[PDB]
């Protein structure tokens, strides 16, 4: 029934992808960026709170972010999954682009992780199972994520993960070559200037699991160039508190060799779901969010015609 779920999810996706929804509404600060800001808003007619991303059309064009912006909104309005943010409304006016999405009050996994220090292996596994399912979902749609890290994972009121940003996501069947992502989370094939595929998201999962369970990533240094050197050597050292099952999973995820990396072999995602570290994981209950969480908290008209 995973095959039936994924075939119906791809049908649902393609329809929305091929005919995107536009102009579905009309016009505190939670954060800011170079081409916009995110605000907590209230929908007047229902009294419901949402996060609204306001993007300055002029600043998007100037910073060469047109394609990334059009693409991110296109993905957001087409996807449907429990760990991917629900886009409620999107619209534009003379000056800005607007994306109204679910408000995720818990903040980033990043803050909770630096505060607590490290997560226990069951706690790290609860989040890791949600990422496994999300990538299985995205990859079935030919969507490569390319920016997994604690900074990009919001924790909701039920303690579950919410992914809001798809700034580097690309819908591609085979290989792609863009040098993008975060230095600590880069697969060796992205650093080595060769063509790469969706297996880079499985490498990033390895980095995420290691960082959540250790409290620091497997490869760090004072400068990105020195981090790239450690990644391409692939010499990973594990803390003594890491269980035998964890080290083995991480050895298979943080695999430089693509013909050996878990998630990229003939059995696919099932090499990860059937790993010993995940023996106690109820995959269907994770999907359904029935597992109790271990933690509970006119400018540029031509360029944005498709938005």
């Amino acid at each position: 029934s995973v095959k039936e779920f994924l075939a119906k999810a791809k049908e649902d996706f393609l329809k929305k992808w091929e005919n995107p929804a536009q102009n579905t509404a009309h016009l505190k600060t939670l954060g800011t960026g170079s081409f916009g800001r995110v605000m907590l808003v209230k929908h007047m007619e229902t009294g419901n709170h949402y996060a609204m991303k306001i993007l300055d059309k002029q600043k998007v064009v100037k910073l060469k972010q047109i394609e990334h912006t059009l693409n991110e909104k296109r993905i957001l309005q087409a996807v449907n999954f429990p760990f991917l943010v629900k886009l409620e409304f999107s619209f534009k006016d003379n000056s800005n682009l607007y994306m109204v999405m679910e408000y995720v009050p818990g903040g980033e996994m990043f803050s909770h992780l630096r505060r607590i220090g490290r997560f226990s292996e069951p706690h790290a596994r609860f989040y890791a199972a949600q990422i496994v399912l999300t990538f299985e979902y995205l990859h079935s749609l030919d969507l490569i994520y390319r920016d997994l890290k604690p900074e990009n994972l919001l924790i909701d009121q039920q303690g579950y993960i919410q992914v809001t940003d798809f700034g580097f996501a690309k819908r591609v069947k085979g290989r792609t070559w863009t040098l993008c992502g975060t230095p600590e989370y880069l697969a060796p094939e992205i650093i080595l200037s060769k063509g790469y595929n969706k297996a880079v998201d499985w490498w990033a999962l390895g980095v995420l699991i290691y960082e959540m369970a250790a409290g620091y990533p497997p490869f760090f240094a004072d400068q990105p160039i020195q981090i790239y050197e450690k990644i391409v050597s692939g010499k990973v050292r594990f803390p003594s508190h890491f269980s035998s099952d964890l080290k083995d999973l991480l050895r298979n995820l943080l695999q430089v060799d693509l013909t050996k990396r878990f998630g990229n072999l003939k059995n696919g995602v099932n090499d990860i779901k059937n790993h010993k570290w995940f023996a106690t994981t109820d995959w269907i209950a994770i999907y359904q969010r029935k597992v109790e969480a271990p933690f509970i908290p006119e400018k540029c008209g031509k360029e944005f015609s498709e938005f």
């Binding site: 900074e151 040098l179 992502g181 230095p183 050292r237």
Partner: peptide, 18 residues
Amino acid sequence: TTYADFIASGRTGRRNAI
């Protein structure tokens, strides 16, 4: 220790994409 090396790296805060 590896923890002290991490703090010394200056990469303990929010990391930007390249």
